[PDB]
């Protein structure tokens, strides 16, 4: 099942390697524990706001 | 608990369009994803169409089916809506609604409903 793989200096421009990441997101009826960030202004006193 | 309630069944004719609609109550499904399928009589159940409850609302369809009967969804009142098109004989089936999770990539049924029978015939 498995070949050998490998990079050198000679390879071209699309034989070069490359890193890869993959970021996955799937929801489940589990209660949600990641959120993305979540804004704040500036604090404004002495009048109504 | 969570309750499943299909609506909107009957008999269309080859080429004329319909709509089945199930309510999804109990609970909330942003989370999950909202599907139907179908059993056509005397098979077994296929895959209609799936919907997510998310910004980036993912779809996915059965392959003989595929862009013909239209699948949305709301997250208010927590529906599921399947818009059949152009339909043919060789889709008639009872139709379910399904609510599920996303594992793996995967639209995996969590709840089902009691279906309900959307015949085409000539």
């Known amino acids: 099942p498995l070949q050998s793989y490998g990079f050198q200096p000679t390879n071209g421009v699309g034989y070069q390697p490359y890193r890869v990441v993959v970021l996955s997101f799937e929801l489940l009826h589990a209660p949600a524990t990641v959120c993305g960030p979540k804004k704040s202004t500036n604090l404004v006193k002495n009048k109504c706001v | 608990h969570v309750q499943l309630v299909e609506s909107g069944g009957g008999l269309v004719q080859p080429g004329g369009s319909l709509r089945l609609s199930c309510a999804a109550s109990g609970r909330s499904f942003n989370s999950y994803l909202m599907g139907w399928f179908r059993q056509a009589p005397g098979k077994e159940r296929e895959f209609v169409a799936w919907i997510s409850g998310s910004p980036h609302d993912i779809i996915r369809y059965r392959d003989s089916v595929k862009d013909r009967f239209t699948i949305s969804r709301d997250n208010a009142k927590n529906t599921v809506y399947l818009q059949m098109n152009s339909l043919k004989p060789v889709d008639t089936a009872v139709y379910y609604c399904?609510?599920?999770?996303?594992?793996?990539?995967?639209?995996?049924?969590?709840?089902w409903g009691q279906g309900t029978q959307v015949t085409v015939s000539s």
């Open positions: 399904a609510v599920g999770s996303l594992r793996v990539g995967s639209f995996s049924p969590d709840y």
